[PDB]
């Protein structure tokens, strides 16, 4: 009775995984960013959940299950009750007590550790759960990938020392790598934002897909791998060029953009700069950050600078004019009455053009040292295709990624705030050093399709297929065909395979049945017919296959065993 | 292994709550919100697995529906307001309204509107195992009355009542398979279905003294009903003949059954209680009379057609304006409102009632003679020793923990959210629905409520978190530490769930033993340099009184038989 049950019965879905997940009856919308898992969709979901839980256990983590509803008072200990922003879904109960529906669980698990972790002989320990979160995304979109309710594997490890944290952290990296291999994904772990300049201890796991919202950077020869947020930028040139022009004021009443200098004044874009006035970390101060005309400011690198306020805030036009005496489109490093930091590539420029900090004027032929001192230099830009690999090996390619996991060395941020402390073996109170590890279990189901699909529909990796074999008769009411078919279901089920049986009547044509089984990603099809049973044979076709086959009935069970290998 | 699982009691009053706290199975986050600790999650998953197997074997299809539910769906059924303060409501950042669902009737009916479009897809039975939130006013009893709890909730859809009954019966059978595999002593009982008589609602109850429900059995038949549902028949075959004339008596300080009995030497079976309730017709009142030794069954009262559901008791001001006399002076004689008497009241003779005149009673009232007999109904709770309404035996009342409910819902939601499908002959049909729920969280606690002893938790075999505890005495000795790891592998390879107690010379053997017994592990093996010399392993069962020594080779056989 299987298809007349599992198959059940788009207009806005724009990414392929969302459209296919809806068309294939894997999920359906309830409200904005809230999706029901349909019977066939839940079969795939649980397959993900099984592998992730197996590798978390094999890596020594202890599954727990914490509440969804959480006391605001915990979120007030970390300050995140306010600081988290409008993505936190806040509520009150019938007694006017305040809660959120958790998007994550750092406070709750730290609260647990306060009460449960009392001796150094219990450390290290790593707790994880597979549980529904809520995030009030301002614009839920992309189906399972930017929903509001989604499933998360979130894990939290506690340590007495940095080395202890690293070992567990390394084990999680390895377990994640096992997880996304068993899931049969084309993935890449990359270095990620750790809040600091340089250093380590933050890695993202990405599935490669041309719809990726993350840009991820790779050496074309070395193992270098990093989110563009983190990717160190080093300049292509080896030395600063020599001064070949004098500095001069140029009237620029209508030249206020990189485009206008390059196209209008014919300047090589390598001879232009963008100045970005941001707020200072010192209250009320301004900082000017400068990148070359053909580059962009990396905002994460920007806010990592000690002089720069984190998070990044851009100065207003009125602030800019009050400080500098000129406004956007006429700004530059010369006679700049505010602190400045220039990108590494900008320090090597020569004979370049800058806004003069005089309205409607630029300097042309600026040269560092001759016309003004070089200010502080830092890595402020994003890398671009073909940039040198920062490890000196090869050049950089940028690909698109869907983030499906993140691991992060958290330190003592929560154990300081929530007074989670344990005595070291020598008797010293130690603030527990924490790590956090997350996988977007929901997002994984969708990520797989973004990467594996064709014109016929979903292509599942082997571990995710909701069934392995579809039986399609083809006049299924024929006693001859219904007995061969029902026996075949039993044999194949007996041997352990997961078989979907298409029991729909003649009112559903064979071609439609074929297209349905293909759409839902079932990797093997078997068609039973009286004309083939006469000939003593069975018709086979693979999901990726071009033409069907005919297999002698007697050979079929060995043949399917081989395919499933 | 125990350095990890064991981790390190005040407001706990029922035993399952103290034991779940002390065995490190759960811990509290806030009121009614509890974290499953690693030991606890293992037990809960063993419950879910068994529930899921039997749901699937019964042909139901697992889905997973959102926890946050839009208010507009709840407004279609009227439950957005009607469900009460137990509904957790919120607004998102865009000021749209939702609840955190306590149940999913509207959601699954909404799903069906979009997915059930052909009769060839029916019958169909959807279920999920999913966290609910119910904003209980006074959350208590640990897992038994928390606010967040795990629930297997199922909903089936049908084109005919017969179709529903079949699926309903398979859910009944599957629940029994479930609770049998969970090793519980349960009983299914008839339950309140909304109507007088009839079937279509059964509750599954674990038998325990702490049960909040009263469930009625015959000591002679299979009869089993929630006291809310139990039919009461009188212990009398016939109304007695009149042997007093009716008189007016002054009862100035007589306003309770006890005062009428102890102040006038009347037997309690000659007295009555008159309860004045709101009638279903707007603005009307109905009086409900039971005998002085009985209580009013409020489920039975509300099921009366004249009586408003849910039941509302009349105020004292309302009584006085209607009748002309107050509580404690009420009765059926000269009663200017409609009246319903319990079956037993109808058989009474020579009986006392308030006269509907302040501080007065009639004595020696007799039906037909002094006043006409009103309508008769089954209005009272049964009491221990009552006749069994199937005519086989008398009735006993025991206390039960409700772990499962099945209910024939009909077209309540399909009619309101317009869920209709064309029959094979082309007639539109509102889908008939049944709903089935198992308190998965609650089942864990109900098990301990019925299985425990002086030393801690007793688990039915299917729920034990581990089957074997390895307690190496002096595990720091490398001779014991090798034999035990060797043993851990052998047993884990054999497919047994084994908890190695790796704790050190700090925690004494005696403490280690008590901890393994508290968390309810069925079987223990002690490895020692003592018995290693003798080539022997020490074994003890969780229920046994003495431990015993055991040749090592025989041990793998001995223990596989133990769990057979
Ligand atoms: Mg990111
Ligand atoms: Mg009840």
Number of strands of chain A: 30
The chain-level structural class of chain A is alpha+beta
Number of helices of chain A: 17
C-alpha-based Rg of chain A, rounded: 30 Å
Total individual domains of chain A = 3
CATH topology of the largest domain in chain A: BirA Bifunctional Protein, domain 2
Distance between the termini of chain A: 27 Å
Largest sheet of chain A: 9 strands, mixed
Strand content of chain A: 25-35%
How does the overall form of chain A come out from the CA principal axes? globular
PDB class: ligase
Keywords: ssgcid, Proline-tRNA ligase, Seattle Structural Genomics Center for Infectious Disease, ligase
Assembly: dimeric
Entry title: Crystal Structure of Prolyl-tRNA Synthetase from Pseudomonas aeruginosa
Account of the protein in words:
Two copies of one chain form a homodimer. Chain A is globular and about 95 Å long. The longest helix of chain A is centred in the N-terminal third of the chain and has 21 residues, at 162-182. Chain A folds into three domains: 1-9 and 459-565, Anticodon-binding domain (Rossmann fold); 10-234 and 383-458, 2-Layer Sandwich (BirA Bifunctional Protein, domain 2), CATH 3.30.930; 235-382, no CATH class. In chain A, a hairpin with a 5-residue loop joins strand 17 (352-355) and strand 18. Chain A is built from 17 helices and 30 strands. In chain A, strands 3, 7, 8, 9, 10, 11, 12, 20 and 23 form a nine-stranded mixed sheet that branches. Chain A has a five-stranded mixed sheet with strand order 27-26-28-29-30, with helices on both faces. Chain A has a four-stranded mixed sheet with strand order 14-15-16-19. Chain A has 565 residues and is an alpha+beta fold. Chains A and B meet through helix 1, strand 1, strand 2, helix 3 and strand 3 of A and helix 1, strand 1, strand 2, helix 3 and strand 3 of B. Bound molecules: magnesium ion (2 copies). One magnesium ion binds next to loops of chain A.
